[PDB]
Structures are given as structure tokens and as C-alpha cells.
From a paper:
In each case, the process of viral membrane fusion is mediated by the trimeric viral spike glycoprotein (S) that is cleaved into S1 and S2 subunits by multiple host proteases upon infection. Two heptad repeat regions, HR1 and HR2, distant from each other in the prefusion S, drive membrane fusion by assembly into a six-helix bundle. This HR1HR2 bundle formation is thought to provide the energy for membrane fusion and is therefore a target for therapeutics, as exemplified by peptide inhibitors that disrupt infection by the HIV-1 (19, 20), SARS-CoV, MERS-CoV, SARS-CoV-2 (23–25), human parainfluenza virus 3 (26), and respiratory syncytial virus. We therefore designed a scaffold to efficiently determine structures of the postfusion HR1HR2 bundle and its mutants to near-atomic resolution by single-particle cryo-EM.
We determined single-particle cryo-EM structures of the five selected single mutants and the Omicron triple mutant of HR1HR2 using the same molecular scaffold (NpDps4) and data processing workflow as for the EM structure of the wild-type HR1HR2 bundle. We observed various effects on neighboring residues for the D936Y, S940F, V1176F, A942S, and the Omicron triple mutant. These structural effects correlate with changes in fusion activities for these mutants —the D936Y and S940F mutations result in a loss of a salt bridge along with a decrease in fusion activity, the V1176F mutation on HR2 slightly displaces Q957 on HR1 along with a decrease in fusion activity, and the A942S mutation introduces an additional hydrogen bond along with an increase in fusion activity. In contrast, the fusion activity of the A924S mutation increases approximately threefold. Overall, none of the five single and the Omicron triple mutations dramatically altered the architecture of the HR1HR2 bundle, as indicated by the small RMSDs between the wild-type and the mutant structures.
Numbering used by the authors:
A (entry chain C), B (entry chain B), C (entry chain A): 918 to 988
D (entry chain E), E (entry chain F), F (entry chain D): 1164 to 1200
The structure:
Amino acid sequence: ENQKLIANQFNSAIGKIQDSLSSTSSALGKLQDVVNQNAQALNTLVKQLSSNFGAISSVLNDILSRLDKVE
Amino acid sequence: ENQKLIANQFNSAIGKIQDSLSSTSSALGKLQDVVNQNAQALNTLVKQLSSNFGAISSVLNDILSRLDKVE
Amino acid sequence: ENQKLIANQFNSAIGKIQDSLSSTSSALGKLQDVVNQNAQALNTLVKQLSSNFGAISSVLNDILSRLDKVE
Amino acid sequence: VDLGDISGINASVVNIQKEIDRLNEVAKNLNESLIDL
Amino acid sequence: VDLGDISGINASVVNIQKEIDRLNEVAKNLNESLIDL
Amino acid sequence: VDLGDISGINASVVNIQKEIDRLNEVAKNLNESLIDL
């Protein structure tokens, strides 16, 4: 009787720990997906910002150049 | 006697696994809070950068326009 | 015999839960490292962007100033 | 001058609140699996 | 004018797929530790 | 021209080192809960 109680409680605990492990795996997978998406987003932003400040630098250089030509 | 040993060891293990599950829940909550804050931060930065490069584009357009008026 | 079965199954389950806890600790450590690196990256980007738009504001101000001097 | 458009750059959010709630629920329910001989 | 260079700013990626796979593997293998008297 | 101020945009950091340390501590202490008949 006590053995059946120990076995039932252990099976219940193993079921609950399986649920907890599945929940932890799902949470870690979602966090991985989101962190990787934000990493790709920051990298894309950094790249396109590099390009955009490059364009701004070029146009400001042309402005300053003809500018200088003016006076 | 062996049943009491099994029961005590199982209760100790369940207590330690409860501590581990609480620690995992706290860690996942903190990671969620921080990842969401950084997501909102990147989104705010992207929005205000869009506005700021819009302003820069407008002022460079006005500069190039009057510029062109000069010569 | 049933006690030895309960003990063996419990030892196996505790070993597997130890493996799962080590995996969760490793995953949380890696996620912490990556989230902190991306936080430092976003902060560095925000700082250097502040400096860069400061420079752009200064040069556009000088342009508009001499510009105004022109006409 | 037409600067590059960055308005599409977006960062997702994570919603693992269900899983954190399940973890705390299991950490609370494991007291119903303790052995009382 | 020489604007600041930001090309070095990079964001790492995380690869915890091994650990998620191990967690699911253990959640599946724990059925081999159930007690059948 | 007054460009928008972005200096307030800040990204928090996470400090779950206590929880990772507790997880490893429990993974080490669970050897004290093994059954030795």
C-alpha cells in the first residue's frame, strides 16, 4: 500500500516535471526566436544606417564643395 | 525504514525541484521583461530615426533647392 | 524488489532532471550573455548616433548660416 | 536626395507569460505530489 | 565632414538549440523512469 | 535646424546570475537526494 502510494506520487511528480520541462523548452525557444529576430533587426538597422550616413556624408561633401565654389 | 528513506529523499528532491522551477520562472520573467524593453527601445529608436532622417532629408532638399537658385 | 525498482527509477529520474537543470542553466546563461551584448550594442549605437546627429546638426547649422550670408 | 527608408525595421516582442505561469503552477502543484506515509 | 563610423556595431545571436533539444529529449525520456509495480 | 534628441533611448540589461547559480546549485545538490538502500 505504501509502495503504491510512493509509486503514484512519483508518477504524478514526473508528469508535472515533464510539463515543466516542456514549458521551459517552449519558453527558451520563443526567447531564442525573439532575441535572434531583434539581433537581425539591429544588424539590418546598423547596415542601412551606415549606408544612409554614407549618403548624407556624400551629399554634405558635395554641398560644402560647391558652397566653397560659391565664395 | 527503507520506505521512510525513499519518502524523505523524494520529498527533498521535490523541494529542490520546486526551488529550481521557481528560479527558472523568475529568470524567464526577467529575460522577458528585458527583451521586451529592448524591443520597445529599438522600435522607439527606429521611429524617431525615421522622423529625424525625414527632417534631414527635408532640410537637405531645401538647401539643394536654394543652392540651385544661387547659381 | 519493488523498493529496488522504485529506487532505481528515482535515481534515473533525478539524473535526467539534473541533466535538464544543467541544460536550462546553460541556456539561460547564453541568453543572458546575448541579451546583454545586444543591450550594450544598442546603447553604443544610441550614443554614437547622438554624437553623429550632433555633428550633422552642427554642419547643417554652419551651412544654413553661411548660406544665409550668401543671399 | 532620397535617404534610405528604415521604417520597416521592427523588433518582435516575446510573450512567454503562459509558460512562466505554467512553471509557477507546477512549482505550486508539486506539493500535492509529496509523500505522506 | 567625416561622420562617425558605426559599421562595427554588431549584435550577437544565440544558439541554445542544443539545450532546447536536450530539454525535450529529457521530457520524452522521463517516461522511461515512471514506476510500474 | 534642431534634430530630434535620442539620448534618452536606453536598453536595460538582465541580471539572472542569481537564478543560474541557484539552478546549478540545485543540479549539484540533487545528488544528496539520491536513494542508497
